[PDB]
């Protein structure tokens, strides 16, 4: 019958590694490298597309910096389309606990909620995992500024500063070195840029092979703005932390 | 069963209910506590119809309850009310609806401020100063009307909860055996004992 | 890979057959059927000193005249128990009376071969079920994740049955008292247990007709061990 | 729906399934349970490659299933989550049921029984989690510690450990941990707990979590510096 | 039907009538509306008997798996509410279920009041049936926790008296029972033509009754 | 070979090894006879120990009043099939008030055992099955195969060593055929029929069991020192 | 609108003795103010020494009968072939009446045999299960004409020793099967007098040791 | 739950010393509109069972197709199908009562009253009775609707019980349904002059008698009727 074809997604190894989320992982390392960093006054989201052409519209494209609500937003490593179908389950998540408690969605609830999805097709199924690895970046009146990451596992941490994709192991390393406890979002804006253009396997890092994204409490008083750059506000940050 | 009365005070909640409970022509019981604490700064008094008031209490307790161990955390009096509401308007429309009237009054302890929310059994949410439901706010809204003030202190709002089942109990051609009186504020729930 | 419910060349269901091997891996778990009641006797089996031995649960009751000792894999007869006592006090709620030993097992052993592509495997765990019935009287059974049972005047199972059942063909006999096989089910299980035997890592039970299902103190236990030691140093 | 046999016997009678599964509790950071005279302690080992990590929001190790029962674990991170889920769902729908709280046992049986019914259903794999409950039972002032495995076995423990390493900190316990007199008071308790964690740690730093469990459903969870005291105090008694 | 039960220094007593009607036809002259649900568990019945012995005859079997489960007796608190919540799932149905649910555990003497509707009710006094208003009347003067043993099985014995002597659907005989702490004790049936002149003598009253 | 991993797979001969091999289960399985005359029909069974203080397992179970099998294989399959046999007897007494033609049954267990021979993931009955009854057309014999084949018969025997007492019915055909209204020579027929498939061990009182039905004979099992009479 | 019900009337009566029980019925099946049978049996034996009347609603009396005579059968096969007892049968019985809780088995059911110590038994059903043990019940259509008379006739209600005036009552003997046989017959006799759906024939059924015996009487066929 | 729209009247039978009889008009009613007029209402199941069927006529020409589609089915490997293990009287009333009895608990009946008469193997005579409620009886005579309240007070003359049956011969018998069906038609509103019979023997078999008329009928006295009291012209 069917059996034959069956390639057991969700199954240990001998070892006690589920393959199928290792071989996920393995994939999320070929994608584009995505940093988060936490500042007292801020988060941060950069991300670099991956080798992109002339022709593309980068104004109108959106490949790893998606916003889940006013308050959260999302820096994408792996499968865009795999990304996508777990962006709009907890942009709905997002308003389901809206509708019902009439106050914005916790960042860990919204975070714990899509890891628990992703957990799922790990365990039950026989389905492949998403190959999708999350940094959440969000704010609420609980516990502030909060950065996570979650993988295909299902399995989810909280972070003053990480990267997911590409060079995390250096980048880790490169991010662990300068960052300090009492730093802004001006000075981590500057980390995250820096991180990238060493870390890059690019020649040269510039504006069109870049997404970012800042949430500040810099909006007009006691509340929250999320502000997805422009291509040219890109451009400007470049050179403005001397990179271009 | 009969009469919730609630009023907010300056910096508390006070939730009044009856005690009687009749079955046919018999008062079976006269202590009866109409009330389940939802979180440590949150009381919901109810009334409605038999059998349903208690479990619709119980069924939102647990998941209240379940909500406070999940995330280490008390949810706001608004946000449990919003969530009761849901539940009540979800109710209604149902095979067998819920007939429950409740008061939810609870102690905000991230904006210091008392709050208190009526919500009838179709899902009617209003947030009030002072609240009743049934029959109960015919009789006691002229008084709390006249002698209601914002700036209230615990004991105040006693006097003048007093005087408004004073009436009740004078008008009503209900006995309704007194009420059990609970005192919502920044250091929790407590009953008073002696009313 | 291959069909859960398959049949091997032999005619037999791999499955089964596997689990039968689990089954061996199981500590010593033994019964004696008498006339003044079935004595049912389990090897606790700790894994480490700091594990509280009386939470060792091997020895069950299913109801007040029906009690159960279990062997292999121990988390899979929770199930099998839970099914047995709904089975026994619903038969009590349609007939007004207590359920014949027999039917009880039977209804357990139904649950067996319920395993397909339903649960996906069968059970790794052998059952020893003991009681007392009006009809048949005192009884001992034996039932398998085959689906198959076999009553028994004596039975062994687990890690030491081969060797223990050997012992139990020369010692049973038809007018034993409880009192003697007592001590034959300490006996027994003190030959083919690793550790010494105690009252700490040993565990007896009865089921009588005047008392019904009971699991024995620790404190009672070790008096017949102590009376063991004394008859077996008699001569 | 997909009911693929994926937990099934072996020729020799095992199931490689449940026993992977066991492995990747092996590779879990280790987490300690031990039973004082009127407390419980659990500990638990946060490795140390993960820095840069906020500690205010990164899942702490240890949780709450009730105001009188907390569950911490072995294995996968993620597993885990389902099987706190369920216990604390369960835990109020006894509540709402009986009229009162789960007990200790009551609770390990349920998550237990969860564990079990995941190596013999169709289309689902075994959790990668062993756990340790411990608690009070209501109006009851005998500590209770528990341990849970992926096969669905549960048993008692007067002390347990569990994860990665774990066979040296349980050969610690053994020759430390005396049974008829078992630690006194919490410092004992606490100090005995953090102990039998140095030996497999590696820094007394942010490594290890202790989280107090005391009856009447009182549970606290020691900070870093309090922990750091008796990281300081063992070490120097160790210098003799 | 008439059926009470009172929590007391020593225990809870429990007293039913043993009448049953189909219209005004007496169907029953003598019928058991009381259930040994355990050695420390009682049930009364009021409302229709088919109701009252198949859904207590449940909770039986549910109190009986607890006990198997947990190697000990169930709460007459849990028991009661068991007992509520089988009536929630036939909400609206048309059961007709009036208990009070008797017994000794750790709290304690138990007495638990549950109808049709869910409703569950704790108590130290409770009186179900068509003739309950004349058996609170005697029980509400005579009241109290410092009764005896022998005179607490009087007074809710003469309770039923009462409301069988006035009630039309309430007689045929009394059934008493007394809940301690080694479990329940049946005191016995009580023909009510028989009890009514041998209390109208010894007491003095039921004056207006010519005898 | 490579071909016997499931039932829904022929071989290239056109063999269905999982039902031979649920066919060899059988074979291994205990001796039981079934023979029949005009008037009744009659079961004899070897019934098969674990060991000395093991019972003997039961090898015959009543369907209804009129109508009973042997088992030979799985136990637990013929307590399956056999209940589903009680089921089917019982829908045609409530339903049309008749009695379940023997023949009509065997059609039912063919079809059932059937089923689970062409479909994905079941597996088929490891048990044979030797039904006796007596109905409107008289005594009846039928042979029951997993593979789905039902067989009306004289006589026969299936289990281990089943070709003894099958040759030995083979010759007495003609005989026992001709036993009307004499039921412990029918009985003695079968016993001495089953006593050609036995090597070592010998007919005693707890080994032996057998079973009866005929034209004023409701099906009756004899076990115990009920059957003493015959050894 | 459909009525699923109707009311075939008859009625039955069940006496418990010392060591016997008997339960009596009338033969007549009627629709209204027709007959639709003179001698349609109405009490059956079920097996194991146990006899059934299902009286009312005749298409729910067979279907109830049908039922539990199977439940009997498959006792046997589930529990290896072992008597059922009257009390287990009376309980069997309460669980196929309420499995119709809300479409009720319109018919007042009666039961009789021995119990297990070898005493007479009658047990009593209602439409919707409750049931309960008792010494003498009669059921359907002319059960409030001949229940008062079986009070006190059988257990000598309101009948006290004379001289005393009230003060020691009648002694409750033990009926012989001759004499409830005499009381069956003028129960029935006299029922047939005054009400109009009880005649035609009486069949009574009487349960000893021995096993289950009958006896026919003619009744008025007006 | 439905109404009856065209509707079959009265079937009346009764047993005799070697077998039954039963009868029924070929009428169809559409309330009071007599519609149809070659309606039979006796259905045939083999050589040895006749079905008389009263009330709603599509739920009869439904029942007509089980009892046909039952025949078929009873011959599917069966060898015996026309000799030991053919279709008895009993079963094809047990059938039919089963499904009665199923349709009314479902709250959607078959809107009938049926009489299923016959002959079984052994020779005993079968005659039976059931109705949209699934409620069955037995009787020496049976008939439904009307003939319930003015055939089988007639045919009860002649059979009144159990042992007037040896004594009952075909002709008589014959007579007393013939009769019976002139005294319906006299009464019976809803009722023709034209009818069907069906005599079960267990010697002679089935003999099935169509295209019957009532005849013999007292009229001529109308005459000399006048008015409604005082009227003498
Ligand atoms: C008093 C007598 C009436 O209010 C009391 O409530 C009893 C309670 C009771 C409880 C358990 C056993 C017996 C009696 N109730 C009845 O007697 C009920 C009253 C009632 C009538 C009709 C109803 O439908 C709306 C509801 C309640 N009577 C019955 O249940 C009656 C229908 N059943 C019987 O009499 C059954 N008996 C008759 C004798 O044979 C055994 C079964
Ligand atoms: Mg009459």
Redesign the pocket.
């Given at each position: 019958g069917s059996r034959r074809y069956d390639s057991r997604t969700t199954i240990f190894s001998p070892e006690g590694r589920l393959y199928q989320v290792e071989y996920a992982l393995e994939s999320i390392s070929h994608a584009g490298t995505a940093i988060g960093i936490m500042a007292s006054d801020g988060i941060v989201l950069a991300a670099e597309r991956k080798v992109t052409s002339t022709l593309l519209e980068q104004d109108t494209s959106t490949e790893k910096l998606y916003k889940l609500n006013d308050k959260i937003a999302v820096a994408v490593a792996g499968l865009t389309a795999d990304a996508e179908i777990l962006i709009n389950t907890a942009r709905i998540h997002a308003q389901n606990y809206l509708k019902t408690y009439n106050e914005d969605i916790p960042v860990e609830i919204l975070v714990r909620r899509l890891s628990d999805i992703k957990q799922g097709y790990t365990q039950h199924g026989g389905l492949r995992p998403f190959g999708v690895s999350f940094i959440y970046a969000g704010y609420d009146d609980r516990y502030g500024y909060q950065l996570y990451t979650s993988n295909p596992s299902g399995n989810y941490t909280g972070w003053k500063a990480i990267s997911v994709g590409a060079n995390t192991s250096a980048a880790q390393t490169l991010l662990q070195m300068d960052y300090k406890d009492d730093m802004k979002v001006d000075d981590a804006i500057e980390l995250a840029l820096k991180t990238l253009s060493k870390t890059t396997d690019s020649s040269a890092l510039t504006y069109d092979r870049l997404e970012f994204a800042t949430i500040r409490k810099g909006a007009n008083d006691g509340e929250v703005y999320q502000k997805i750059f422009k291509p040219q506000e890109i451009k400007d940050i470049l050179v403005k932390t001397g990179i271009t | 069963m009969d009469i919730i009365l609630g009023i907010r005070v300056q910096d508390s909640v006070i939730l009044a209910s009856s005690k009687a409970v009749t079955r046919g022509i018999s008062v079976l019981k006269d202590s009866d506590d109409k009330t389940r604490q939802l979180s440590p700064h949150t009381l919901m008094s109810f009334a409605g119809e038999a059998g349903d008031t208690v479990q619709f209490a119980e069924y939102i307790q647990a998941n209240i309850q379940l909500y406070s161990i999940r995330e280490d955390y008390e949810l706001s009096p608004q946000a449990v009310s919003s969530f009761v509401r849901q539940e009540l308007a979800k109710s209604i429309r149902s095979r067998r609806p819920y007939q429950v009237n409740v008061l939810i009054g609870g102690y905000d302890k991230k904006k210091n401020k008392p709050e208190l929310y009526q919500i009838d059994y179709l899902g009617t949410k209003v947030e009030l100063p002072y609240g009743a439901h049934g029959y109960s706010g015919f009789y006691t809204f002229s008084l709390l009307d006249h002698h209601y003030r914002p700036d209230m202190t615990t004991e105040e709002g006693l006097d003048l909860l007093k005087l408004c089942v004073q009436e009740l109990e004078k008008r009503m051609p209900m006995d309704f055996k007194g009420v059990i009186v609970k005192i919502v504020d920044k250091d929790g729930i407590r009953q008073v004992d002696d009313f | 890979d291959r069909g859960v419910s398959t049949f091997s060349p032999e005619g037999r269901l791999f499955q089964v057959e596997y689990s039968l091997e689990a089954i061996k891996l199981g500590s010593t778990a033994i019964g004696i059927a008498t006339k003044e009641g079935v004595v049912l006797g389990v090897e606790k089996r700790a894994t480490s000193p700091l594990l509280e031995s009386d939470s060792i649960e091997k020895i069950v009751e299913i109801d007040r005249h029906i009690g159960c000792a279990m062997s292999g894999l121990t988390a899979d007869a929770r199930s099998m128990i839970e099914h047995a006592r709904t089975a026994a006090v619903t038969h009590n709620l349609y007939y007004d009376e207590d359920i014949n030993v027999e039917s009880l097992t039977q209804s357990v052993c139904d649950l067996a071969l319920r395993f397909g592509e339903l649960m996906s495997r069968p059970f790794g765990v052998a059952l020893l079920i003991a009681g007392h019935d009006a009809d048949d009287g005192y009884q001992l059974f034996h039932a398998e994740p085959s689906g198959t049972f076999y009553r028994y005047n004596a039975k062994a199972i687990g890690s030491g049955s081969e060797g223990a059942q050997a012992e139990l063909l020369n010692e049973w006999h038809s007018s034993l008292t409880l009192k003697e096989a007592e001590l034959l089910v300490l006996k027994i299980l003190k030959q083919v247990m690793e550790e010494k035997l105690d009252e700490n890592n040993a565990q007896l039970s009865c089921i009588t007709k005047q008392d019904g299902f009971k699991i024995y103190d620790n404190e009672k236990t070790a008096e017949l061990i102590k009376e063991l030691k004394e008859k077996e140093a008699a001569e | 729906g997909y009911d693929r046999a994926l937990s099934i016997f072996s020729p020799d009678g095992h199931i490689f399934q449940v026993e992977y599964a066991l492995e990747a509790v092996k590779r879990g950071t280790c987490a300690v349970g031990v039973k004082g005279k009127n407390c419980v302690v659990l500990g638990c080992e946060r490795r140390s490659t993960l820095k840069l990590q906020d500690t205010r929001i990164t899942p702490s190790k240890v949780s709450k299933i009730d105001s009188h029962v907390v569950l911490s674990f072995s294995g996968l991170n993620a597993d885990s989550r389902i099987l706190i889920e369920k216990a604390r769902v369960e835990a109020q729908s006894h509540r709402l049921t009986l009229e009162d709280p789960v007990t200790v046992e009551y609770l390990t049986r349920y998550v237990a029984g969860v564990q079990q019914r995941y190596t013999q259903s169709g289309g689902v794999r075994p959790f990668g989690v062993s756990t340790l409950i411990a608690g009070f039972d209501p109006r009851d002032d005998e500590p209770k510690l528990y341990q849970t495995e992926p096969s669905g076995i549960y048993s008692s423990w007067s002390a347990q450990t569990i994860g990665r390493n774990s066979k040296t900190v349980r050969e610690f316990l053994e020759k430390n941990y005396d049974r008829k007199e078992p630690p006194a008071t919490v410092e004992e308790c606490v100090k005995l707990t953090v102990r039998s964690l140095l030996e497999v740690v590696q820094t007394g730093a942010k490594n290890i979590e202790i989280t107090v469990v005391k009856p009447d459903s009182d549970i606290v969870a020691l900070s870093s510096e309090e922990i750091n005291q008796y990281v300081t105090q063992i070490e120097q008694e160790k210098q003799e | 039907?008439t059926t009470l039960a009172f929590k007391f220094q020593h225990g809870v007593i429990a007293a039913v009538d043993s009448?049953?009607?189909?219209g005004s036809y007496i169907?029953?002259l003598r019928?058991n509306?009381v259930i040994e649900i355990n050695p420390y568990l009682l049930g009364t019945?009021?409302?229709?008997?088919?109701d009252?012995?198949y859904w207590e005859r449940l909770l039986a079997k549910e109190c009986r798996l607890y006990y198997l489960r947990n190697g000990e007796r169930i709460s007459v608190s849990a028991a009661s509410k068991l007992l509520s919540n089988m009536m929630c799932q036939y909400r609206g149905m048309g059961l007709?279920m009036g208990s009070m649910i008797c017994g000794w555990d750790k709290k304690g003497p138990g007495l638990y009041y549950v109808d049709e509707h869910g409703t569950r009710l704790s108590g130290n006094m409770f009186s179900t049936?068509?003739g309950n208003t004349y058996a609170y009347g005697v029980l509400d003067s005579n009241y109290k926790w410092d009764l005896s043993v022998e005179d607490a099985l009087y007074l809710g014995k003469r309770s039923i008296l009462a409301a069988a002597h006035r009630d039309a659907?309430?007689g045929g005989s009394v059934n008493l029972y007394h809940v301690t702490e080694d479990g329940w004790i049946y005191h016995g049936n009580h023909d009510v033509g028989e009890l009514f002149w041998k209390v109208k003598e010894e007491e003095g009253s039921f004056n207006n009754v010519i005898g | 070979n490579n071909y016997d991993g499931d039932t829904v797979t022929f071989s290239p001969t056109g063999r269905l090894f999982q039902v031979e091999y649920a066919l060899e289960a059988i074979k291994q399985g205990s001796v039981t006879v079934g023979l029949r005359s005009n008037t009744h029909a009659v079961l004899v069974a070897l019934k098969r120990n674990a060991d000395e203080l093991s019972s003997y397992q039961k090898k015959i179970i009543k369907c209804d009043e009129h109508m009973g099998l042997s088992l030979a294989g799985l136990a637990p399959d013929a307590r399956v099939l056999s209940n589903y046999l009680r089921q089917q007897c019982n829908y045609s007494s409530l339903v049309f008030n008749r009695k379940l033609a023997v023949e009509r049954a065997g059609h039912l267990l063919c079809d059932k055992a059937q089923k689970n021979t062409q479909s994905y993931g079941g597996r088929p009955y490891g048990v044979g099955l030797l039904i006796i009854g007596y109905d409107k057309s008289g005594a009846h014999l039928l042979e029951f195969q997993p593979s789905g084949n039902v067989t009306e018969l004289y006589g026969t025997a299936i289990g281990a060593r089943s070709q003894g007492a099958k040759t030995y019915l083979e010759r007495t055909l003609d005989t026992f055929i001709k036993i009307d209204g004499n039921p412990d020579e029918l009985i003695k027929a079968g016993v001495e029929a089953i006593s050609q498939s036995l090597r070592d061990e010998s007919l005693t009182v707890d080994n032996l069991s057998i079973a009866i039905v005929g034209k004023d004979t409701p099906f009756t099992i004899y076990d115990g020192e009920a059957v003493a009479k015959y050894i | 609108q459909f009525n699923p019900y109707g009311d075939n009337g008859g009625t039955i009566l069940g006496i418990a003795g010392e060591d016997f029980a008997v339960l009596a019925g009338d033969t007549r099946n009627i629709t209204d103010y027709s007959i639709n049978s003179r001698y349609e049996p109405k009490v059956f034996d079920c097996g194991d020494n146990i006899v059934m009347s299902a009286n009312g609603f005749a298409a729910d009396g067979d279907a109830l009968v049908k039922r539990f005579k199977n439940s009997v059968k498959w006792y046997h096969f589930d529990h290896n072939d072992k008597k059922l007892s009257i009390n287990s049968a009376a309980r069997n019985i309460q669980h196929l009446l309420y499995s119709r809780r809300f479409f009720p088995y319109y018919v007042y059911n009666i039961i009789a045999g021995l119990d297990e110590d070898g005493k007479g038994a009658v047990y009593?059903?209602?439409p919707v299960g409750?049931?309960?043990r008792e010494q003498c019940?009669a059921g359907g259509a002319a059960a409030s004409l001949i229940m008062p008379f079986l009070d006190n006739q059988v257990n000598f209600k309101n009948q006290y020793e004379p001289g005393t005036n009230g003060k020691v009552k009648k002694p409750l003997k033990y009926l012989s099967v001759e004499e409830v046989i005499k009381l069956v017959r003028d129960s029935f006799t006299s029922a047939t007098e005054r009400h109009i759906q009880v005649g035609d024939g009486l069949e009574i059924l009487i349960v000893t040791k021995d096993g289950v015996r009958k006896e026919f009487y003619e009744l008025k066929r007006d | 739950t439905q109404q009856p729209i065209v509707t079959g009247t009265s079937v009346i039978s009764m047993k005799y010393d070697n077998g039954v009889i039963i009868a029924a008009d070929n009428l169809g009613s559409y309330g009071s509109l007599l519609r149809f007029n070659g309606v039979e209402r006796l259905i045939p199941v083999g050589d040895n069972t006749v079905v008389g069927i009263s009330g709603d006529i599509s739920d009869m020409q439904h029942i007509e197709r089980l009892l046909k589609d039952l025949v078929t089915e009873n011959a599917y490997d069966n060898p015996l199908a026309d000799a030991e293990e053919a279709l008895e009287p009993s079963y094809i009333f047990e059938y039919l009562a089963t499904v009665m009895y199923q349709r009314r608990s479902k709250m959607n009946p078959l809107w009938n009253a049926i009489i299923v008469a016959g002959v079984q193997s052994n020779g005993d005579q079968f005659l039976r009775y059931v109705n949209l409620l699934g409620v069955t009886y037995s009787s020496p005579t049976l008939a439904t609707g009307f003939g319930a309240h003015m055939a089988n007070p007639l045919l009860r003359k002649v059979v009144d019980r159990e042992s007037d049956i040896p004594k009952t011969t075909v002709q008589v018998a014959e007579e007393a349904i013939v009769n019976a069906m002139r005294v319906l038609y006299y009464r019976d509103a809803r009722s023709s002059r034209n009818f069907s019979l069906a005599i079960i023997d267990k010697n002679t078999g089935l003999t099935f008698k169509k295209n019957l008329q009532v005849e013999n009928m007292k009229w001529d006295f109308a005459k000399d009727i006048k008015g409604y009291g005082t009227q003498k012209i």
């Open positions: - | - | - | - | 039907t009448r049953a009607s189909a169907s029953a019928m509306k019945m009021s409302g229709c008997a088919a009252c012995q007709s049936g068509s659907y309430s | - | 009593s059903f209602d409750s049931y309960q019940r | -």
